[model samples]
Target: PQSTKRFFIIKSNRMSNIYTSIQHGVWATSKGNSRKLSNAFTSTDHVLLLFSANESGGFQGFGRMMSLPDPQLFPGIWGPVQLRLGSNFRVMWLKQCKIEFEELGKVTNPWNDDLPLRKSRDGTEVPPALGSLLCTWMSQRPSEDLLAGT
Candidate 1:
């Protein structure tokens, strides 16, 4: 079976935390919106992440990181990640992309107990099961260099 895939650049920036060092993150778009897609991670293992800023610090960012079984979720900084799929299964790839860090600058830990749906303001009325249905939608790949971009 054949499937359609959409590519995205999930890039994170540096946070204003002088106490700890926060590593920036990037996830590739691996799948498209369809009824066939399942969950990528389980609720129990999932970790909610937030990107914030100070009152006069100028902070802004997006969504949480649901845990996938694979540890490949934390690959050091790189370029645009790739998400490929065919009908049902999907995979991720870290290709050499032109990373402009000047525009990519800080990330925050805004993770909380709040469960937002597709939109940041919207809430999940009835939370789904513990596991994700889109587990195979995004497969993680290994990278060889982290300093290549820095």
Candidate 2:
């Protein structure tokens, strides 16, 4: 049977920190929002991730999501690395869209600045306005590139 899917958007500060999710095959949110995040998702959901500061920082790519099992609840904070690694929420990528927001805006007829592009500020927000639109944009795809590399 085909499972129904959901969508969310994530905003991060840097590509380096964001890159860890791709390397580890996971996405994460705060422990405080662990249950909230967990309750908000199931396996096979989708994500639209963006970075901050410039064109290169917005809408870098698309991804698939997997809820971390109860056992993997807390993300491992690598010993003194200063980076709280992938959270209880995880990501499976589709393609490296690498499209800039400006380009998307030019083509998008209506402008929506109030996009639900967050996950408890990093938790995993399910946006309808943007989510619906983004999903429509990515509706056409060949297959899952879960291991698509940088």
Alpha-carbon lDDT, every model: 0.25, 0.47
* Weakest ten-residue segment in model 2 by summed lDDT: 46-55
**lDDT at residue 12 of model 1 (Cα atoms):** 28
Worst 10 residues of 1 by lDDT: 130-139
Error of 1 at 91 (Å): 7.5
TM-score of each: 0.20, 0.56
Across 29-126, the per-residue lDDT of candidate 1 in tens digits comes to 23442211224223223322222222212112223332232325433222232223112111222222222222224321133134222222211111
User: Which residue runs of candidate 2 sit more than 4 Å off their true CA positions?
Assistant: 1-3, 42-57, 69-87, 106-126, 136-150
Error of 1 at 120 (Å): 13
Q: Could you give candidate 2's per-residue lDDT for residues 22-123 as a string of tens digits?
A: 666555544654555455554334334422222243455566655553435434532333243334455665554544455445332122244423212444
